[PDB]
Design a protein around this ligand. Structure first.
Ligand SMILES: Cc1cc2nc3c(=O)[nH]c(=O)nc-3n(C[C@H](O)[C@H](O)[C@H](O)COP(=O)(O)OP(=O)(O)OC[C@H]3O[C@@H](n4cnc5c(N)ncnc54)[C@H](O)[C@@H]3O)c2cc1C
Ligand SMILES: [Cl-]
Length: 487
């Protein structure tokens, strides 16, 4: 008989799961498995993203139980767990979604070799990205495109991505009974308290495939908004109703299929001929994700500067004080500090909000390496993606892809074009809730009587600006320009 394992790493969903479909075909028993390293905090990871993962696992548990099955959360490392459950469950097939991250290639190669020794077949379909990213490179002549212009024309020559896979059957082959490594107590989904975290999560975004589909439907409730979507025109200060879809944490963990998202977009585009085109459209946003995945998976040392063939070598400053003030949201610029407070509270900010704080830390004001603020984003972002976090930080620092270092965002003026009243600032920085709007972006310019009346005295309740933007940006521009000369 056939006994299979469907190994979850990414792709925490039931819809568009060709690996799950194969595992259930002609199967007597199916073992849904997620492998959790219980010593991961003994390394970096915030409770916001880790609880998002746990909430996504609890959603899988209810979905499997509704189909007569169960999700098994095995504790330990995959290389040590799988050789045991292969013989214990009489496994003949192992299925999991393909992953192109560096650690994923080392891990999956080791489990493949262990599966061959136990006579287990390995089926690894592609469904985390829109396309077979290795196919895109081969179609382009053996090298990945380096511009969105040429990449968009590559996929247009390939055609539509594959259609989403059909839903799994209403009843699934359950795990075998009385298997010791499948005991319920050892295979349950833990809470954030049990994994070691002390402080509770504060994000307003809940994980799971169910919430992902619900937020997807809410996005397509207004087809004119989907059709005319222009990414650079959205509002970074919108927080009650965010200006974009906020589907990034669900695409990161695979709670939502990128191919289902892409198929729903094509349904809308066929009915609206004046719809927006790449790269500014919603489809173009999925293409930015596919573009950086294609470039990153074929570039060595992509998440670093040294040894990176696509990254420009700049002599960034080793300034721990600027990094600490930026990390702890005490730079003195309320627009910057409010965004960084949103980073650690929600784990998500708008794209242009990430532009403001990344430009401020790097090529704009503080001249700190993009790798340092990178590690800050990697800790708190609930949508942190190894290839997207890296490529966009190389973009904002003018180290890769982007080159117009004369475009420097202002930490004072940028947010005021969207939110002159500072409603976004008063939300995440309640110390300035009573500050008049004339000074909410420049509290240090308010007279001392205004500061006392509002209960926010600069230097006592809110810090002074760490730098003068006119002075700091003038020096940073002249240092980026000289670097590009030797480049
Ligand atoms: C410094 C910096 C770091 C970033 N780090 C991440 C990260 O770790 N994870 C991440 O998902 N995005 C990252 N981004 C990209 C972008 O800011 C987010 O994808 C976006 O804010 C998510 O909001 P949304 O889901 O509403 O996007 P929408 O505008 O609704 O776009 C839909 C989807 O397209 C993709 N997408 C959108 N913009 C980009 C982009 N610029 N690059 C790649 N894919 C994109 C995402 O999967 C997103 O969910 C980063 C950007 C910057 C400037
Ligand atoms: Cl500006």
């Amino acid at each position: 008989v056939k006994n299979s394992i469907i190994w979850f790493r990414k792709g925490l969903r039931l819809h568009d799961n060709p690996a799950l479909l194969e595992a259930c075909k002609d199967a007597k028993h199916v073992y849904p498995v997620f492998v959790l390293d219980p010593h991961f905090l003994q390394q970096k990871v915030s409770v916001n993203r880790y609880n998002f993962l746990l909430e996504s696992l609890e959603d899988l548990q209810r979905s499997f139980q509704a189909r007569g099955s169960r999700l098994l959360v095995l504790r330990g490392k995959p290389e040590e767990v799988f050789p045991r459950v292969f013989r214990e469950w009489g496994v003949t097939q192992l299925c999991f979604e393909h992953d192109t991250e560096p650690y994923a290639k080392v891990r999956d190669a080791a489990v493949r070799r262990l599966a061959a020794e136990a006579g287990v077949e390995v089926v690894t379909p592609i469904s985390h990205t829109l396309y077979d990213t290795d196919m895109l490179v081969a179609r382009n002549g053996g090298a990945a495109p380096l511009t969105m212009q040429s990449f968009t024309k590559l996929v247009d020559r390939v055609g539509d991505p594959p259609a989403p896979a059909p839903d799994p059957p209403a009843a699934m082959p359950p795990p075998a009974e009385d298997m010791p490594s499948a005991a319920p107590a050892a295979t349950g989904v833990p809470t954030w308290q049990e994994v070691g975290f002390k402080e509770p999560p504060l994000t307003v975004f809940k994980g799971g495939e169910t919430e992902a589909l619900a937020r997807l439907e809410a996005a397509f409730q207004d087809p004119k908004w989907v059709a005319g979507f222009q990414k650079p025109d959205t509002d970074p200060s919108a927080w009650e109703k965010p200006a974009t879809t906020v589907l990034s944490p669900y695409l990161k963990f695979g709670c939502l299929s990128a191919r289902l998202f892409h198929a729903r977009l094509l349904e809308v585009y066929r009915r609206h001929p004046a719809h927006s085109q790449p790269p500014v459209s919603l489809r173009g946003q999925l293409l930015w994700r596919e573009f950086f995945y294609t470039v990153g998976s074929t570039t060595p040392n992509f998440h670093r500067m040294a040894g990176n063939p696509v990254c420009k070598q700049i002599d960034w400053d080793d300034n721990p004080e600027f990094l600490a003030a930026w990390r702890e949201a005490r730079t003195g610029f309320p627009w910057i500090d409010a965004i960084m407070t949103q980073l650690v509270t929600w784990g998500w900010m708008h794209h242009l909000a990430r532009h403001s704080v990344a430009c401020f830390l790097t090529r704009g004001d503080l001249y700190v390496s993009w790798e340092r603020g990178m590690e800050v984003f990697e800790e708190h972002l609930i949508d942190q993606d190894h290839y997207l976090n890296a490529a966009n930080w190389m973009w904002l620092s003018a180290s890769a892809f982007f080159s117009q270092y004369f475009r420097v965002y202002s930490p004072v003026v940028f947010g005021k074009k969207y939110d002159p009243e500072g409603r976004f600032i008063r939300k995440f920085l309640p110390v300035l809730k009573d500050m008049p709007a004339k000074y909410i972006y420049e509290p240090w310019t308010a007279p001392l009587e205004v500061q006392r009346k509002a209960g926010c005295v600069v230097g006592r309740d809110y810090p002074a600006p760490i730098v003068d933007h006119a002075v700091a940006s003038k020096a940073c521009i002249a240092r980026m320009a000289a670097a590009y000369r030797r480049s």
